[PDB]
Design goal:
homodimer; 364 residues; alpha/beta; Aminopeptidase; nine-stranded mixed beta sheet; 6 helices; 25% strand; binds manganese (II) ion; binds zinc ion; zinc (chain A); AstE_AspA_cat (chain A); metal-binding (chain A); hydrolase activity, acting on ester bonds (chain A)
């Protein structure tokens, strides 16, 4: 009662062909559609173990015949990064062959569909959703990527663009559970943030060079703006969950995160004959990404933190110092009030290294 | 206060010349000699901060004119590794240019001196120590390394081989404070182990491919065996201190470790007009390296630990599992009673990855030849 696909990438520079294993729990192309992936950055582990245990919960839901939609699970979304060992360490953030970030350069499904949708939209929002989703699938079918990493990105967006719910599971080098989403999907995804116990929710309409979560949700916002004459709702509700620290692999945590993801699926109509009960209290407000402070090391040296992970800090507070063991010490200050939701796992800096993050409000 | 030397390495593949900063607090070639280095593995930080604070303590001792010997301090013994960033991470264990481990392929000063010492030894132990140390310095003078990493290794052993006390400050990926020394320097270095609060003391006569600590202490043991007709004491007392986890950078800890290193220097006659007092409780017995179990991942996957760092584990206990999130789970057991003094910081495995260490007392059948 669970489908398993092993999608084969083309051979890399060493002639090695890698596979993306994809699990599907429901009725193909039916009902509501959910997409959950982990390990796009192959060195970010908590999502991998969480989806292993979410599978155990969905295996039971399938046996009890309780799966209402199509639920797509990819515990290891990036088998290219997962092979990239150097000197005994897994470096899973950048592609060795291209040097590019695994969570950048996704297709713009607005740019690829605006031409095709010219005469296809009506006053019926539900019609527009089905037309836009079919157009997106067609547009992607016409693309012929060659590099393993481009083929990987292509498959992942092909299997997620038409979903109602998309959770990209990530981690930071040393961080509290936090969430990113498209600004206008707040407060729509309050329930998701609450269930996973996010300690920061960071909002943007456009962030970097076309990341995966924005590749899924942004097109609905940009098409709405392209065709203001028609009802185009934000049909694909995507978010990035930073579930914790890159190396935070704990049995209890992964089980708790799997249970939270299961509760999210129940709340959004993927699981039948299960009572959830009261939504947990959200521990933070949604804030703009533009209001977040990156703490940067102005020089090389030891990273000495004066604040614990998750401390509420005030503008002017000494948060972290760079200590040259054969030289000088430099103090680095908070420039905004907020929560120090991220630091770093490797306590040595190079100049301009991001060594921490504070979720602020941008007051005036 | 102190002498400061900036020893220049030859230019690397990008034409960049790196320097090793060396501090000296005493006279020269004087009294007892101490050598302390940190960051030979450039991604191992606790020793770097500890020696910065040990310098603060020695600056004050120098101002008060209380340094009795020569004390040599190198907080960052490896400026080659310290530059080796890849994808925003510091890879400080292996040399990019040679592929070699920074703490391997040191000179065998027994092999380099046995020929020269043929007719130089007498019934006077103290004479033999001075003869062997002078011979070691000469033997090293004759060597002409060309590659930056070989020149670096050469300088570090040249400035440490003739020391009475050598502490090579290291860290492990995720570990409790623990110590390695030459088997016959146990119990001699019980005081050192006690002051640094080692939770494991691991003994070997020869470990891997010629590491630094053994390069300093082994020659005395091997020369004693080469010339059994003469008194050759273990003149150079070396140990490796794994001070904690690679990224364990804490003000309190570095200050506590600096204070402990200072107390070791006082106990061994390097600091005047300071009394130390009662030796702290030793937390563990000295055990053989061959009695230590390396836990190895038999396959790739998530590393899921069932035991906390520092837990006492029994033979047969499930300590760690390798979990393929799209496959099977494999359980890994303790095969000896002992303390799980090390695990690992990066909780994903490749086959044969060492993912933990248990300090046992019974020698294990598989642990021969390291
Ligand atoms: Mn400081
Ligand atoms: Mn398990
Ligand atoms: Zn990420
Ligand atoms: Zn080391």
């Amino acid at each position: 009662t669970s489908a398993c696909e092993n999608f084969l990438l083309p051979a890399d520079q060493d002639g090695i062909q890698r596979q993306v294993t994809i699990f599907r729990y429901g009725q193909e192309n039916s009902a509501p559609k959910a997409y959950l992936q982990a390990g796009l950055h192959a060195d970010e582990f908590p999502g991998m173990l969480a989806l292993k245990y979410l599978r155990d919960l969905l295996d039971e839901a399938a046996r009890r015949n309780r799966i209402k939609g199509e639920i797509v699970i990819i515990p290891q979304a990036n088998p290219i990064g997962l092979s990239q060992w150097k000197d005994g360490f897994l470096l899973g953030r950048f592609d060795h062959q291209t040097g590019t970030n695994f969570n950048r350069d996704y297709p713009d499904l607005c740019q690829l569909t605006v031409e095709k949708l010219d005469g296809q939209l009506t006053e019926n929002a539900e019609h527009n959703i089905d037309v836009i989703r079919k157009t997106m699938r067609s547009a992607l079918s016409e693309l012929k990527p060659e590099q393993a990493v481009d083929v990987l990105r292509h498959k992942l967006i092909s299997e997620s663009c038409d979903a109602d719910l998309v959770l990209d599971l990530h981690a930071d080098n040393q961080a509290q559970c936090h969430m990113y989403t498209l600004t206008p999907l707040w407060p729509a995804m309050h329930d998701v943030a609450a269930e996973i116990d996010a300690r920061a929710v960071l909002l943007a309409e456009e962030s970097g060079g076309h990341p995966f979560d924005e590749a899924c949700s942004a097109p609905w916002m940009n098409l709405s703006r392209a065709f203001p004459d028609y009802p185009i709702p934000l049909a694909c509700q995507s978010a990035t969950f930073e579930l914790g620290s890159n190396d935070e692999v704990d049995l209890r945590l992964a089980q708790d995160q799997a249970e939270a993801l299961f509760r999210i699926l129940i709340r959004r109509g993927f699981i039948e004959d299960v009572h959830v009960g009261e939504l947990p209290q959200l521990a933070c407000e949604g804030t703009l990404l533009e209001a977040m402070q990156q703490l940067k090391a102005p020089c090389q040296g030891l990273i000495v933190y004066h604040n614990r992970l998750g401390d509420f800090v005030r503008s002017g507070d000494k948060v972290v110092s760079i200590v040259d063991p054969i030289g000088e010490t430099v103090d680095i200050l908070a420039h905004t009030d907020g929560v120090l939701f991220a630091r770093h796992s490797q306590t040595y800096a190079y100049p301009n290294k991001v060594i921490g993050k504070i979720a602020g409000k941008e007051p005036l």
